[PDB]
Design an enzyme around this catalytic site. Structure first.
Site, PDB file in Angstrom:
ATOM      1  CG  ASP A  57      -4.354  25.387 -18.060  1.00  0.00           C
ATOM      2  OD1 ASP A  57      -3.523  25.858 -18.870  1.00  0.00           O
ATOM      3  OD2 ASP A  57      -4.939  26.188 -17.258  1.00  0.00           O
ATOM      4  CD  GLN A  61      -7.954  32.900 -16.298  1.00  0.00           C
ATOM      5  OE1 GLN A  61      -7.611  33.726 -17.128  1.00  0.00           O
ATOM      6  NE2 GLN A  61      -8.219  33.209 -15.013  1.00  0.00           N
ATOM      7  CG  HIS A 142     -12.641  16.983 -44.318  1.00  0.00           C
ATOM      8  ND1 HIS A 142     -12.938  17.074 -45.643  1.00  0.00           N
ATOM      9  CD2 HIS A 142     -11.663  16.033 -44.204  1.00  0.00           C
ATOM     10  CE1 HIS A 142     -12.225  16.173 -46.311  1.00  0.00           C
ATOM     11  NE2 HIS A 142     -11.435  15.478 -45.465  1.00  0.00           N
ATOM     12  CD  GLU A 143      -9.182  14.795 -41.736  1.00  0.00           C
ATOM     13  OE1 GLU A 143      -9.267  13.568 -41.685  1.00  0.00           O
ATOM     14  OE2 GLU A 143      -8.801  15.340 -42.783  1.00  0.00           O
ATOM     15  CG  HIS A 146     -12.285  11.064 -43.261  1.00  0.00           C
ATOM     16  ND1 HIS A 146     -12.752  10.639 -44.450  1.00  0.00           N
ATOM     17  CD2 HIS A 146     -11.444  12.089 -43.485  1.00  0.00           C
ATOM     18  CE1 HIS A 146     -12.212  11.424 -45.395  1.00  0.00           C
ATOM     19  NE2 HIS A 146     -11.383  12.322 -44.860  1.00  0.00           N
ATOM     20  CE1 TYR A 157      -9.597   9.262 -48.154  1.00  0.00           C
ATOM     21  CE2 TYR A 157      -7.188   9.078 -48.372  1.00  0.00           C
ATOM     22  CZ  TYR A 157      -8.333   9.824 -48.241  1.00  0.00           C
ATOM     23  OH  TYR A 157      -8.278  11.171 -48.277  1.00  0.00           O
ATOM     24  CD  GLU A 166     -10.607  12.925 -48.595  1.00  0.00           C
ATOM     25  OE1 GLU A 166     -10.852  14.041 -48.044  1.00  0.00           O
ATOM     26  OE2 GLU A 166     -10.074  12.376 -47.665  1.00  0.00           O
ATOM     27  CG  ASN A 183     -17.455  34.828 -40.743  1.00  0.00           C
ATOM     28  OD1 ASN A 183     -18.018  35.765 -41.300  1.00  0.00           O
ATOM     29  ND2 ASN A 183     -16.784  34.960 -39.585  1.00  0.00           N
ATOM     30  CD  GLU A 187     -14.422  28.852 -51.836  1.00  0.00           C
ATOM     31  OE1 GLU A 187     -13.229  29.006 -52.056  1.00  0.00           O
ATOM     32  OE2 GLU A 187     -15.228  28.522 -52.705  1.00  0.00           O
ATOM     33  CD  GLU A 190     -13.172  28.939 -45.344  1.00  0.00           C
ATOM     34  OE1 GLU A 190     -13.215  27.922 -46.097  1.00  0.00           O
ATOM     35  OE2 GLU A 190     -13.887  28.777 -44.322  1.00  0.00           O
ATOM     36  CB  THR A 194      -2.087  30.826 -47.832  1.00  0.00           C
ATOM     37  OG1 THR A 194      -3.405  30.992 -48.314  1.00  0.00           O
ATOM     38  CG2 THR A 194      -1.528  29.601 -48.556  1.00  0.00           C
ATOM     39  CG  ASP A 200      -5.888  31.418 -50.609  1.00  0.00           C
ATOM     40  OD1 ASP A 200      -6.308  31.987 -49.581  1.00  0.00           O
ATOM     41  OD2 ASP A 200      -4.714  31.085 -50.671  1.00  0.00           O
ATOM     42  CG  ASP A 226      -4.999  12.572 -53.933  1.00  0.00           C
ATOM     43  OD1 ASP A 226      -4.941  12.595 -52.693  1.00  0.00           O
ATOM     44  OD2 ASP A 226      -5.983  13.113 -54.512  1.00  0.00           O
ATOM     45  CG  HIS A 231      -7.210  14.589 -51.160  1.00  0.00           C
ATOM     46  ND1 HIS A 231      -6.338  13.565 -50.996  1.00  0.00           N
ATOM     47  CD2 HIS A 231      -7.765  14.906 -49.919  1.00  0.00           C
ATOM     48  CE1 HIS A 231      -6.363  13.276 -49.681  1.00  0.00           C
ATOM     49  NE2 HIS A 231      -7.207  14.066 -49.010  1.00  0.00           N
TER      50      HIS A 231
HETATM   51 CA   LIG Z   1      -5.427  32.380 -47.202  1.00  0.00          CA
HETATM   52 CA   LIG Z   2     -15.358  26.749 -45.188  1.00  0.00          CA
HETATM   53 CA   LIG Z   3      -3.634  28.339 -18.043  1.00  0.00          CA
HETATM   54 CA   LIG Z   4     -15.924  30.114 -43.581  1.00  0.00          CA
HETATM   55 ZN   LIG Z   5     -10.441  13.762 -45.887  1.00  0.00          ZN
END
Ligand SMILES: [Ca+2]
Ligand SMILES: [Ca+2]
Ligand SMILES: [Ca+2]
Ligand SMILES: [Ca+2]
Ligand SMILES: [Zn+2]
Ligand SMILES: [Ca+2]
Ligand SMILES: [Ca+2]
Ligand SMILES: [Ca+2]
Ligand SMILES: [Ca+2]
Ligand SMILES: [Zn+2]
Lengths: 316, 316
Positions: A57, A61, A142-143, A146, A157, A166, A183, A187, A190, A194, A200, A226, A231
């Site tokens: 960059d 910034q 999570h990733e 692994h 796997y 998983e 926060n 879950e 989230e 979506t 959700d 799967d 999963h």
């Molecule tokens: Ca959502």
């Molecule tokens: Ca979460």
């Molecule tokens: Ca920049």
């Molecule tokens: Ca959260």
């Molecule tokens: Zn995974």
């Protein structure tokens, strides 16, 4: 790159502003030299060839919309490295400060993120099912977990060992989300799933059945999709881990919670000292019992709660 | 490694003995310096961490059963590099002699092989569904062709573009199998698939419906599994490519074959000059017509046969 360590500022996927560790050598690069052998973030530029170009960059910034996913990938890899170092005394994923590399902007409209054996890869999402996946710290942790599993237990796997693999990624991704106090919840995904629906997530650890995953061993999926349900059947273990931490009565079985910190200590010990590539659920139970035994004594409340939790999800 | 180029001898997965290009520097390594920037083969040692260790051997003779998959991975990467160089004037997959890396012995009982964006990875199979996947030259050339596609058209891995991307890998894997004259056929993966059954394969290009894949556009799969059917809907294009090469009457439409060499020239031109990341079947048809036009004239038999083949599989 060889250059001078410095600090730049940018905006992540969710619009939040953050400081990030960069390196200066003509350009400013997303290369953090303060953690281990370095955390490096690359631009895959909408292609599938990896790792792409180390992110460069001109002014340190990173407020362009194209920059966002790279800011969070870079930043949340540093928070996950800190979690493992400060909490579990592990330096990077191999235990010897291996460099952590991530590429963002992988392919076009790609609804996923993954550790491929050598580095982290993140799609940008299609904008409807997902927004750029590196905006979710539980997804990044999570990733990256692994990578820890691949260097320690080596869970394959597929079938029950892949479901364990998983679930372990969901548990530590959640524990890292609580550690950064962003926060936190039980879950998964989230913050990036979506954008048009509130409330959700991809999966739930506190109530896996909300999205149709099993919360009991009698409900496990036994087919072939799967890779044997890795999963899907991870809900059973997810629910067991949530009960050990938070407590609750599940199918009539009552569990006293012992909290998040002990949950992380027992599972990290199980993972690094007793699980093997082909462990199945029943051997995870024995590994967690043995780990809690090692840490708190065979007549502790902590061993008691690990047994109750596995009995409540039907894992003997 | 830096060392002296030499030649060793070993046995492949099927028991066939072959010479392989190695490098000597204390140990003998599977490192071929005669092609481009090198072909390097690694041992992943039953783990999922990549690439694992560059394969080292004490005496340059690779006749142990553990060595087999590494011999063929190493050797068939060299035959595929030769095919692209001699036939299409392409140096390696990026067109500039990029080094080709492969790891063998990936994970435990892993029934697959793949190009991950940076290198080739091969499981050993479970011994029942597959034997080590690098024993199949059509499998090795299929995966190495994804590296060529990733650097040129960039077809995304989903819906019709991912089906095109799979079919292109089957076509060139088959053309490489004919180029090495290793018992060639129009089937995919028959040398390594189900050791206990003779005569079958994973897929068929000459009759995709034998294993239940579509051979006509009216039969395409429209759901969501397999990223929108990328291994399923590739039968439609596979059958079109087989007809262009070999000729035949399919759903009442008659196609005069123009042979394998012209088939490879038209599709390689289509792939490298006209296909884009989101091409769909109808734009593949236009790309192949334009390519055959470029090479043989708009009133040639070769353009005529490309149209008939796509009309016979219902692609307008
Ligand atoms: Ca959502
Ligand atoms: Ca979460
Ligand atoms: Ca920049
Ligand atoms: Ca959260
Ligand atoms: Zn995974
Ligand atoms: Ca030897
Ligand atoms: Ca054959
Ligand atoms: Ca074949
Ligand atoms: Ca067979
Ligand atoms: Zn493929």
């Amino acid at each position: 790159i060889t250059g001078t360590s410095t600090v730049g500022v940018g905006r992540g996927v969710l619009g939040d502003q953050k400081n990030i560790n960069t390196t200066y050598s003509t350009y400013y690069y997303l290369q953090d030299n303060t953690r281990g052998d370095g955390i490096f973030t690359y631009d895959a530029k909408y292609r599938t060839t990896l790792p792409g170009s180390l992110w460069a960059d001109a002014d340190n910034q990173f407020f362009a919309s194209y920059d966002a996913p790279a800011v969070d990938a870079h930043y949340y890899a540093g928070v996950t490295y800190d979690y493992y170092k400060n909490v579990h005394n592990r330096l990077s994923y191999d235990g010897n400060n291996a460099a952590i590399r991530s590429s963002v902007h992988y392919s076009q409209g790609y609804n996923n993120a993954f550790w491929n054996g050598s580095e982290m890869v993140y799609g940008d999402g299609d904008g409807q099912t997902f927004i750029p996946l590196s905006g979710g710290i539980d997804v990044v942790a999570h990733e990256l977990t692994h990578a820890v599993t691949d260097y320690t237990a080596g869970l394959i796997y597929q079938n029950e060992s892949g479901a364990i693999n998983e679930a372990i990624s969901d548990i530590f991704g959640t524990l890292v989300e609580f550690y950064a106090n962003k926060n936190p919840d039980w879950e998964i995904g989230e913050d990036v799933y979506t954008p048009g629906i509130s409330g959700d997530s991809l999966r739930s650890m506190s109530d896996p059945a909300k999205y149709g995953d099993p919360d009991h061993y009698s409900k496990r999926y036994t087919g072939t999709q799967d890779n044997g349900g890795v999963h899907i059947n991870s809900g059973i273990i997810n629910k067991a881990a949530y009960l050990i931490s938070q407590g609750g009565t599940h199918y009539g079985v009552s569990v006293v919670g012992i909290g998040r910190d002990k949950l992380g200590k027992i599972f990290y010990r199980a993972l690094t000292q007793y699980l093997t590539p082909t462990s199945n659920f029943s051997q995870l139970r024995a590994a967690a019992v043995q780990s809690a035994t090692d840490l708190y004594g065979s007549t502790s409340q902590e061993v008691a709660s690990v047994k109750q939790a596995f009995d409540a999800v039907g894992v003997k």
